[PDB]
Amino acid sequence: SSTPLNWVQGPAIFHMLTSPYTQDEIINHEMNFLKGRLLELQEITGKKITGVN
Amino acid sequence: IVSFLLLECDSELIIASLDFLYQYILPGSQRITELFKSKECSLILEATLPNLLSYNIA
Amino acid sequence: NNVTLKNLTAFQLLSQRENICELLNLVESTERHNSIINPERQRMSLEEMKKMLDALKNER
Amino acid sequence: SNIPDPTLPPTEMMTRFLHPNWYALPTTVWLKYGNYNSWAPSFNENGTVVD
Amino acid sequence: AVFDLMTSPFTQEEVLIKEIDFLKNKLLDLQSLQ
């Protein structure tokens, strides 16, 4: 292979049980998911984040 | 666009109009003349800009 | 006041069915067509227009 | 077992069930700019299903 | 959450860093919305 590739376990994609098509419930559950995933990844990596609330 | 400037209850629209006018009159002086050639634009700017100075600052 | 998929599809289908049933002349919509036209309202509006026109004519 | 008796409330299944066919799709917004502001954008239809 | 095995000229570390950046910006935007 002229371009060496790697096996990359990709990023977690947000998946809600009931998709309500409006932005209110979506934004609530999405903020929760974002904070949770940021915490998980900060635990995985040797780094820190700013603005996590 | 200057009429859009004349509104009061939409900060984002006013900022967009002001950014457009800034980019318009920015390169030189002939565009300033073309802008103030119209009597309506001149009157609205003259009545609006000083009141926009004291916009929502109590 | 709320719009869901069911409401939208029902509204569109109702409009289509009404139009087609009107093509075959299977519907009598005199009440709607005369509440929208409202010939009484037509006469009222015409007399109002006449009065306004006379007012504008006599002010000179 | 931990399974309760069939006579104990509640006893209904679809008490808080919502089918996607009623999920309140997005539509127009109908903004209102004062009273004498007629040269103003009245709608805001960005992610609407119907115009 | 869903994880999809993929392939790219990057490494796991750079991908995680890009994910951190994107998620941080998105959370900042969602917070600024309210």
CSV table of all heavy atoms in Angstrom, one decimal, chain B residues 2-42:
chain,number,residue,atom,x,y,z
B,2,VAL,N,-30.6,50.1,4.8
B,2,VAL,CA,-30.6,51.1,5.8
B,2,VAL,C,-32.0,51.0,6.6
B,2,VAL,O,-32.0,51.3,7.8
B,2,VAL,CB,-30.3,52.4,5.3
B,2,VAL,CG1,-30.2,53.5,6.3
B,2,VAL,CG2,-29.0,52.4,4.5
B,3,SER,N,-33.0,50.7,5.9
B,3,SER,CA,-34.3,50.4,6.6
B,3,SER,C,-34.1,49.3,7.6
B,3,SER,O,-34.7,49.4,8.7
B,3,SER,CB,-35.4,50.1,5.6
B,3,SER,OG,-35.5,51.1,4.6
B,4,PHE,N,-33.4,48.2,7.3
B,4,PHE,CA,-33.1,47.2,8.2
B,4,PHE,C,-32.4,47.8,9.4
B,4,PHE,O,-32.6,47.4,10.6
B,4,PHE,CB,-32.3,46.1,7.6
B,4,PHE,CG,-33.0,45.2,6.7
B,4,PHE,CD1,-32.4,44.3,5.9
B,4,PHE,CD2,-34.4,45.1,6.8
B,4,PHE,CE1,-33.1,43.5,5.1
B,4,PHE,CE2,-35.1,44.3,6.0
B,4,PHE,CZ,-34.4,43.5,5.1
B,5,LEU,N,-31.5,48.8,9.2
B,5,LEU,CA,-30.9,49.5,10.3
B,5,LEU,C,-31.9,50.2,11.2
B,5,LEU,O,-31.7,50.2,12.4
B,5,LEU,CB,-29.9,50.6,9.7
B,5,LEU,CG,-28.4,50.3,9.9
B,5,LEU,CD1,-27.6,51.6,9.7
B,5,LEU,CD2,-28.2,49.8,11.3
B,6,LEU,N,-33.0,50.6,10.6
B,6,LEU,CA,-34.0,51.4,11.3
B,6,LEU,C,-34.8,50.6,12.3
B,6,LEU,O,-35.4,51.2,13.2
B,6,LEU,CB,-35.0,52.1,10.3
B,6,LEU,CG,-35.8,53.3,10.9
B,6,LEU,CD1,-34.8,54.2,11.5
B,6,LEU,CD2,-36.5,53.9,9.7
B,7,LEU,N,-34.7,49.3,12.3
B,7,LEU,CA,-35.4,48.5,13.3
B,7,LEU,C,-34.8,48.6,14.6
B,7,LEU,O,-33.7,49.2,14.8
B,7,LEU,CB,-35.5,47.0,12.8
B,7,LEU,CG,-36.1,46.7,11.5
B,7,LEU,CD1,-36.1,45.2,11.2
B,7,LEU,CD2,-37.6,47.2,11.5
B,8,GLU,N,-35.5,48.0,15.6
B,8,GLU,CA,-35.0,48.1,17.0
B,8,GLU,C,-35.0,46.8,17.7
B,8,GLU,O,-34.1,46.6,18.6
B,8,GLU,CB,-35.8,49.1,17.8
B,8,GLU,CG,-35.3,50.6,17.7
B,8,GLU,CD,-36.1,51.5,18.6
B,8,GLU,OE1,-37.2,51.2,18.9
B,8,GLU,OE2,-35.5,52.6,19.0
B,9,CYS,N,-36.0,45.9,17.4
B,9,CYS,CA,-36.2,44.7,18.2
B,9,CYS,C,-35.4,43.5,17.6
B,9,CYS,O,-35.8,42.4,17.8
B,9,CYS,CB,-37.7,44.4,18.2
B,9,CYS,SG,-38.5,44.3,16.7
B,10,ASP,N,-34.3,43.8,16.8
B,10,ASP,CA,-33.5,42.7,16.2
B,10,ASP,C,-32.1,43.1,16.2
B,10,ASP,O,-31.7,43.8,15.3
B,10,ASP,CB,-34.1,42.3,14.9
B,10,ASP,CG,-33.7,40.9,14.5
B,10,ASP,OD1,-32.6,40.4,15.0
B,10,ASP,OD2,-34.4,40.3,13.6
B,11,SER,N,-31.3,42.7,17.2
B,11,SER,CA,-29.9,43.1,17.3
B,11,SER,C,-29.1,42.5,16.1
B,11,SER,O,-28.2,43.1,15.6
B,11,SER,CB,-29.3,42.7,18.6
B,11,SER,OG,-30.0,43.3,19.7
B,12,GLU,N,-29.4,41.2,15.8
B,12,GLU,CA,-28.6,40.5,14.8
B,12,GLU,C,-28.8,41.2,13.4
B,12,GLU,O,-27.8,41.3,12.6
B,12,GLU,CB,-29.0,39.1,14.8
B,12,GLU,CG,-28.0,38.2,14.0
B,12,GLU,CD,-28.3,36.7,14.2
B,12,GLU,OE1,-29.2,36.4,14.9
B,12,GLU,OE2,-27.5,35.9,13.6
B,13,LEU,N,-30.0,41.6,13.1
B,13,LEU,CA,-30.3,42.2,11.8
B,13,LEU,C,-29.6,43.6,11.7
B,13,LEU,O,-29.0,43.9,10.7
B,13,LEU,CB,-31.8,42.4,11.6
B,13,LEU,CG,-32.3,42.4,10.1
B,13,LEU,CD1,-31.9,41.1,9.5
B,13,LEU,CD2,-33.8,42.6,10.1
B,14,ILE,N,-29.6,44.3,12.8
B,14,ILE,CA,-28.9,45.6,12.8
B,14,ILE,C,-27.4,45.4,12.6
B,14,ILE,O,-26.7,46.1,11.9
B,14,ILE,CB,-29.2,46.4,14.1
B,14,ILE,CG1,-30.6,46.8,14.2
B,14,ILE,CG2,-28.3,47.6,14.3
B,14,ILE,CD1,-31.0,47.5,15.4
B,15,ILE,N,-26.8,44.4,13.3
B,15,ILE,CA,-25.4,44.1,13.2
B,15,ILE,C,-25.0,43.7,11.8
B,15,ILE,O,-24.0,44.1,11.3
B,15,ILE,CB,-24.9,43.1,14.3
B,15,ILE,CG1,-25.1,43.7,15.7
B,15,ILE,CG2,-23.5,42.7,14.0
B,15,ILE,CD1,-24.5,42.8,16.8
B,16,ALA,N,-25.9,42.9,11.2
B,16,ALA,CA,-25.6,42.5,9.8
B,16,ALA,C,-25.7,43.7,8.8
B,16,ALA,O,-24.8,43.8,8.0
B,16,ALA,CB,-26.6,41.4,9.4
B,17,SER,N,-26.7,44.6,9.0
B,17,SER,CA,-26.7,45.7,8.2
B,17,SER,C,-25.5,46.6,8.3
B,17,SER,O,-24.9,47.2,7.4
B,17,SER,CB,-28.0,46.5,8.4
B,17,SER,OG,-29.1,45.7,8.5
B,18,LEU,N,-25.1,46.8,9.6
B,18,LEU,CA,-23.9,47.7,9.9
B,18,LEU,C,-22.7,47.1,9.3
B,18,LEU,O,-21.8,47.8,8.8
B,18,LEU,CB,-23.8,47.9,11.4
B,18,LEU,CG,-24.7,49.0,11.9
B,18,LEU,CD1,-24.5,49.1,13.4
B,18,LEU,CD2,-24.4,50.3,11.3
B,19,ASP,N,-22.5,45.7,9.4
B,19,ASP,CA,-21.3,45.1,8.8
B,19,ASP,C,-21.3,45.2,7.3
B,19,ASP,O,-20.3,45.5,6.7
B,19,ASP,CB,-21.3,43.6,9.2
B,19,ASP,CG,-21.1,43.4,10.7
B,19,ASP,OD1,-20.5,44.3,11.3
B,19,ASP,OD2,-21.5,42.4,11.2
B,20,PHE,N,-22.5,45.1,6.7
B,20,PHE,CA,-22.5,45.3,5.2
B,20,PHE,C,-22.2,46.7,4.8
B,20,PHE,O,-21.4,46.9,3.9
B,20,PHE,CB,-23.9,45.0,4.7
B,20,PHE,CG,-24.0,45.1,3.2
B,20,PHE,CD1,-23.7,44.1,2.3
B,20,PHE,CD2,-24.5,46.3,2.6
B,20,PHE,CE1,-23.7,44.3,1.0
B,20,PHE,CE2,-24.5,46.5,1.3
B,20,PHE,CZ,-24.2,45.5,0.4
B,21,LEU,N,-22.7,47.7,5.6
B,21,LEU,CA,-22.4,49.1,5.2
B,21,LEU,C,-20.9,49.4,5.5
B,21,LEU,O,-20.3,50.1,4.7
B,21,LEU,CB,-23.3,50.0,6.0
B,21,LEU,CG,-24.7,50.1,5.5
B,21,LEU,CD1,-25.5,51.0,6.4
B,21,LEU,CD2,-24.8,50.5,4.1
B,22,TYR,N,-20.4,48.8,6.5
B,22,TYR,CA,-18.9,49.0,6.8
B,22,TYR,C,-18.1,48.5,5.6
B,22,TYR,O,-17.3,49.2,5.1
B,22,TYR,CB,-18.6,48.3,8.1
B,22,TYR,CG,-17.1,48.5,8.6
B,22,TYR,CD1,-16.9,49.4,9.6
B,22,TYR,CD2,-16.1,47.8,8.0
B,22,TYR,CE1,-15.6,49.6,10.0
B,22,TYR,CE2,-14.8,48.0,8.5
B,22,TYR,CZ,-14.6,48.9,9.5
B,22,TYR,OH,-13.3,49.1,9.9
B,23,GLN,N,-18.4,47.2,5.2
B,23,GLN,CA,-17.7,46.6,4.1
B,23,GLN,C,-17.9,47.4,2.8
B,23,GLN,O,-17.0,47.5,1.9
B,23,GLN,CB,-18.1,45.2,3.9
B,23,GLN,CG,-17.2,44.5,2.8
B,23,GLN,CD,-15.8,44.4,3.2
B,23,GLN,OE1,-15.4,44.2,4.3
B,23,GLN,NE2,-14.9,44.6,2.2
B,24,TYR,N,-19.1,48.1,2.7
B,24,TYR,CA,-19.4,48.9,1.5
B,24,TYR,C,-18.5,50.1,1.4
B,24,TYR,O,-17.8,50.3,0.5
B,24,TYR,CB,-20.8,49.2,1.5
B,24,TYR,CG,-21.3,49.9,0.3
B,24,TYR,CD1,-21.5,49.2,-0.9
B,24,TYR,CD2,-21.5,51.3,0.3
B,24,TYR,CE1,-21.9,49.9,-2.1
B,24,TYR,CE2,-21.9,51.9,-0.9
B,24,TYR,CZ,-22.1,51.2,-2.0
B,24,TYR,OH,-22.5,51.9,-3.2
B,25,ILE,N,-18.6,51.0,2.5
B,25,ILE,CA,-17.9,52.3,2.4
B,25,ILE,C,-16.4,52.1,2.7
B,25,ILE,O,-15.6,53.1,2.7
B,25,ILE,CB,-18.4,53.3,3.4
B,25,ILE,CG1,-18.1,52.9,4.8
B,25,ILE,CG2,-19.9,53.4,3.2
B,25,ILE,CD1,-18.4,54.0,5.8
B,26,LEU,N,-15.9,50.9,3.0
B,26,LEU,CA,-14.5,50.7,3.4
B,26,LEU,C,-13.5,51.1,2.3
B,26,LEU,O,-12.6,51.9,2.6
B,26,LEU,CB,-14.3,49.3,3.9
B,26,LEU,CG,-12.9,48.9,4.4
B,26,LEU,CD1,-12.6,49.7,5.6
B,26,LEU,CD2,-12.8,47.4,4.7
B,27,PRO,N,-13.6,50.6,1.1
B,27,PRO,CA,-12.5,50.9,0.1
B,27,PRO,C,-12.7,52.2,-0.6
B,27,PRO,O,-13.1,52.2,-1.8
B,27,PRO,CB,-12.6,49.7,-0.8
B,27,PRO,CG,-14.1,49.4,-0.9
B,27,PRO,CD,-14.6,49.7,0.5
B,28,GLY,N,-12.4,53.3,0.0
B,28,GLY,CA,-12.3,54.6,-0.6
B,28,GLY,C,-13.4,55.5,-0.3
B,28,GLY,O,-14.0,55.4,0.8
B,29,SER,N,-13.6,56.5,-1.2
B,29,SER,CA,-14.5,57.6,-0.9
B,29,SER,C,-15.6,57.8,-1.9
B,29,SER,O,-16.6,58.3,-1.6
B,29,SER,CB,-13.7,58.9,-0.9
B,29,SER,OG,-14.6,60.0,-0.7
B,30,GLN,N,-15.4,57.2,-3.1
B,30,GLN,CA,-16.5,57.3,-4.1
B,30,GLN,C,-17.7,56.6,-3.7
B,30,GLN,O,-18.9,57.0,-3.9
B,30,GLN,CB,-16.0,56.8,-5.5
B,30,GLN,CG,-14.9,57.6,-6.1
B,30,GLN,CD,-14.8,57.4,-7.6
B,30,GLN,OE1,-15.5,56.6,-8.2
B,30,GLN,NE2,-13.9,58.1,-8.2
B,31,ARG,N,-17.5,55.5,-2.9
B,31,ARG,CA,-18.7,54.7,-2.4
B,31,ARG,C,-19.4,55.5,-1.3
B,31,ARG,O,-20.6,55.4,-1.2
B,31,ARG,CB,-18.2,53.4,-1.9
B,31,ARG,CG,-17.9,52.4,-3.0
B,31,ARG,CD,-17.7,51.0,-2.5
B,31,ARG,NE,-17.3,50.1,-3.6
B,31,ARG,CZ,-17.0,48.8,-3.4
B,31,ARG,NH1,-16.9,48.4,-2.2
B,31,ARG,NH2,-16.6,48.1,-4.4
B,32,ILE,N,-18.7,56.3,-0.5
B,32,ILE,CA,-19.4,57.2,0.4
B,32,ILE,C,-20.3,58.2,-0.3
B,32,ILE,O,-21.4,58.5,0.2
B,32,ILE,CB,-18.3,57.9,1.3
B,32,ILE,CG1,-17.5,56.9,2.1
B,32,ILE,CG2,-19.0,58.8,2.3
B,32,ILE,CD1,-16.5,57.5,3.0
B,33,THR,N,-19.8,58.7,-1.4
B,33,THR,CA,-20.6,59.7,-2.2
B,33,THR,C,-21.8,59.0,-2.7
B,33,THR,O,-22.9,59.5,-2.7
B,33,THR,CB,-19.7,60.3,-3.3
B,33,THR,OG1,-18.6,60.9,-2.7
B,33,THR,CG2,-20.5,61.3,-4.0
B,34,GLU,N,-21.6,57.8,-3.3
B,34,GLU,CA,-22.8,57.0,-3.8
B,34,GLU,C,-23.8,56.7,-2.7
B,34,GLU,O,-25.0,56.7,-3.0
B,34,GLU,CB,-22.3,55.8,-4.5
B,34,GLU,CG,-23.4,55.0,-5.2
B,34,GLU,CD,-22.9,53.7,-5.9
B,34,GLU,OE1,-21.7,53.6,-6.0
B,34,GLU,OE2,-23.7,52.9,-6.3
B,35,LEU,N,-23.3,56.4,-1.5
B,35,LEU,CA,-24.2,56.1,-0.4
B,35,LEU,C,-25.0,57.3,0.0
B,35,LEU,O,-26.2,57.2,0.1
B,35,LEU,CB,-23.4,55.5,0.8
B,35,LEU,CG,-24.1,55.4,2.1
B,35,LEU,CD1,-25.3,54.5,2.0
B,35,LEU,CD2,-23.2,55.1,3.2
B,36,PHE,N,-24.3,58.4,0.2
B,36,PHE,CA,-25.1,59.6,0.6
B,36,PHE,C,-25.7,60.4,-0.5
B,36,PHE,O,-26.3,61.4,-0.3
B,36,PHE,CB,-24.1,60.6,1.4
B,36,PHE,CG,-23.8,60.1,2.8
B,36,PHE,CD1,-22.7,59.3,3.0
B,36,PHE,CD2,-24.6,60.4,3.8
B,36,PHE,CE1,-22.4,58.9,4.3
B,36,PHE,CE2,-24.3,60.0,5.1
B,36,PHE,CZ,-23.2,59.2,5.3
B,37,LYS,N,-25.6,59.9,-1.8
B,37,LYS,CA,-26.4,60.5,-2.8
B,37,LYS,C,-27.9,60.4,-2.6
B,37,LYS,O,-28.7,61.3,-3.0
B,37,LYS,CB,-26.0,59.9,-4.2
B,37,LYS,CG,-25.3,60.9,-5.1
B,37,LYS,CD,-25.2,60.3,-6.5
B,37,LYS,CE,-26.5,59.9,-7.1
B,37,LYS,NZ,-26.4,59.2,-8.4
B,38,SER,N,-28.3,59.3,-2.0
B,38,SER,CA,-29.8,59.0,-1.8
B,38,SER,C,-30.2,59.8,-0.6
B,38,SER,O,-29.5,59.8,0.5
B,38,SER,CB,-30.0,57.5,-1.6
B,38,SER,OG,-31.4,57.3,-1.3
B,39,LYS,N,-31.3,60.5,-0.7
B,39,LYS,CA,-31.8,61.3,0.4
B,39,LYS,C,-32.3,60.4,1.5
B,39,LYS,O,-32.2,60.8,2.7
B,39,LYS,CB,-32.9,62.3,-0.1
B,39,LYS,CG,-33.3,63.3,1.0
B,39,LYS,CD,-32.2,64.0,1.6
B,39,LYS,CE,-32.7,65.0,2.7
B,39,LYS,NZ,-31.5,65.7,3.3
B,40,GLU,N,-33.0,59.3,1.2
B,40,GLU,CA,-33.6,58.5,2.2
B,40,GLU,C,-32.5,57.8,3.0
B,40,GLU,O,-32.6,57.8,4.3
B,40,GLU,CB,-34.5,57.4,1.5
B,40,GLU,CG,-35.8,58.0,1.0
B,40,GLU,CD,-36.7,58.6,2.0
B,40,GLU,OE1,-36.6,58.1,3.2
B,40,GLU,OE2,-37.4,59.5,1.7
B,41,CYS,N,-31.5,57.2,2.4
B,41,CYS,CA,-30.4,56.6,3.2
B,41,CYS,C,-29.8,57.6,4.1
B,41,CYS,O,-29.5,57.3,5.2
B,41,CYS,CB,-29.4,56.0,2.2
B,41,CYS,SG,-30.1,54.9,0.9
B,42,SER,N,-29.5,58.8,3.6
B,42,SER,CA,-28.9,59.9,4.4
B,42,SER,C,-29.8,60.2,5.6
B,42,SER,O,-29.2,60.3,6.7
B,42,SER,CB,-28.7,61.1,3.5
B,42,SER,OG,-28.2,62.2,4.3
